[PDB]
């Protein structure tokens, strides 16, 4: 259990792994029995594979913690454990008629001054898209029964997200695959 | 930091997250600066998404620990921390002319009596295939300069692995995607 010297993903990342898993222990991927931690681990992995910093990988593990697991009190815990830079990425990632809310979030991302937010966001969306594709191969169009929007609305939203990620210089390794999946799931 | 009641992925899984990250802290994905923990998190995620048990997800986090991070002494630590069932999956996953070694490992998987080994193995290979595909989109054929075998040998080996996973009833969500990626990377 030696602690290596100045590893890129070290003690704070390991603390974040445990914190994310404990915080989301009872949460499930919508419509399934799959533990939600699977999504957070996948997003953290993608961010790391894009050369993400420790702060960015931690923000990836925690990007759903304020929305889904306690709001402002959880944000304060994130600050205490992981610092304000992580907390600021998480808050900026966090999110009236549905279509206006979507447009507001898209413009929020478009105007962001934090490249870390674009990296975390695009990794989150890539994992969600891979998950739709995999579910389609198992249950077919039953996958769409898990969403709070139509297939057409969902495809529109992902297409708009992709355009923003391109204009904000998200990693091409992510946007290339996104574009392939979107075309696939659009039939 | 409440501990929920009997979560599927609980205290031992959280201990395994930390152990895997500490053990592999200095290891990098071959040919890159990417921390190796990214691979282990991705494999654990895939196993969980296929309905894997806690034992299976932990084995996924640890499937490269004996080969890459200390052999039999590390196996004994795995037994002490996570039990002999996890250790037995890890050992059975772990691996003379190259082509005969490959054939021996393929037959080893084919004869396995442990469905957990097939699940962990197929998740490992799916992540490796996704990684090749993503790297191809960034660096093109330079990806092949990272391997200890030719492109033709690598494609052959993945094709044979896929056939075994199908005959051993690995999850179709994994083998369907494997087959797509293999065809893509084969040009
Ligand atoms: Mn998310
Ligand atoms: Mn592996």
Find the radius of gyration of the CA atoms of chain A. 17
Non-local (6+) Cβ contacts of A97 within 8 A are none
Termini Cα distance of chain A: 49
DSSP A28: B
DSSP state of A176: H
- Interatomic CA distance for residues B72 and B69, integer angstroms: 10
Q: How far apart are CA A1 and CA A7, in angstroms?
A: 14
What is the rounded distance in angstroms from the CA atom of residue A146 to the CA atom of residue B48?
19
Round to whole Å and give the CA distance between B128 and B178: 10
A19 and B2 Cβ atoms separated by less than 8 Å: no
Quick one: which of A36, A86, A80, A78 has its CA closest to A60? A86
In whole angstroms, give the CA distance from residue A133 to residue A86.
Answer: 30
How many Å lie between the centroid of ligand 1 and the Cα of residue A146?
Answer: 15
Of A51, A122, A114, which Cα lies nearest the Cα of A88? A114
Distances (CA, A) of A112 to A63, A164, A169: 16, 11, 12
- A100–chain B nearest CA distance, Å: 33
Q: Is B4 on the interface with A (CB under 8 A)?
A: yes
Q: What are the structural domain ranges in chain B?
A: 1-187
Helices A54-61 and A37-49, packing angle to 10 deg = 160
DSSP class of residue A15?
H
Within 13 Å and on the Cβ side, how many CA atoms surround B173?
19
Q: Whole-angstrom Cα distance, residue B94 to residue A52?
A: 30
Q: A145 CB contacts (<8 Å, ≥6 apart)?
A: A31
Question: Residue A120: nearest ligand to its CA?
Answer: 1
Could you tell me which of B60, B44, B132 has the C-alpha nearest to residue A173? B132
Task: Kindly list the distances between the CA atom of residue B86 and the CA atoms of A175, B64, B126, in Å, as whole numbers in the listed order.
Answer: 37, 13, 21
Q: Tell me whether A73 touches chain B (CB under 8 Å).
A: no
Phi-psi map region of B17: left, alpha, beta (phi>0 left; psi -120 to 50 alpha):
alpha
* Helix orientation angle between A115-139 and A151-167, rounded to the nearest 10 degrees: 150
Residues 6+ away with beta carbon under 8 Å from B94: B63, B66, B67
Comparing CA positions, the residue from A2, A169, A130, A175 lying closest to residue B19 is A2
Contact B22 A2 (CB under 8 A): yes
Resolution at which this structure was determined, Å: 1.2
Of A48, A14, A37, A185, the residue nearest A123 (C-alpha) = A48
Q: Which residues contact B75 (CB under 8 A, 6 or more apart)?
A: B66, B87, B90, B91
Beta strands in chain A (DSSP E): none
| DSSP code for B51 | T
Contact B1/A74 with Cβ under 8 angstroms? no
For residue A93, give the ligand nearest its CA. 1
**Experimental method reported for this structure:** X-ray
| Residue A43, number of CB atoms within 10 A of its CB | 28
Q: Smallest Cβ distance to A10: which of B25, B45, B49?
A: B25
């Amino acid at each position: 259990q030696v602690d290596s010297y100045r590893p890129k993903l070290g003690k704070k990342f390991n603390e974040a792994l445990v914190f994310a898993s404990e915080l989301h222990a009872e949460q499930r991927r919508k419509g399934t029995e799959i533990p939600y931690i699977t999504h957070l681990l996948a997003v953290a992995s993608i961010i790391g594979e894009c050369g993400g910093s420790e702060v960015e990988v931690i923000a990836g593990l925690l990007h759903d913690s304020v929305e889904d697991q306690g709001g402002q009190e959880t944000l304060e815990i994130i600050k205490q454990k992981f610092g304000n830079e992580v907390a600021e990425i998480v808050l900026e990632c966090s999110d009236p008629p549905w279509k206006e809310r979507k447009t507001a979030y898209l413009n929020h991302l478009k105007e962001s001054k934090n490249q870390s937010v674009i990296l975390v966001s695009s990794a989150d969306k890539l994992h969600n898209l891979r998950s739709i594709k995999s579910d389609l191969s198992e249950i077919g169009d039953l996958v769409w029964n898990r969403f709070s929007a139509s297939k057409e609305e969902t495809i529109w939203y992902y297409r708009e997200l992709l355009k923003i990620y391109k204009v904000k210089n998200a990693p091409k390794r992510l946007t290339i695959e996104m574009e392939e999946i979107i075309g696939f799931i659009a039939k």
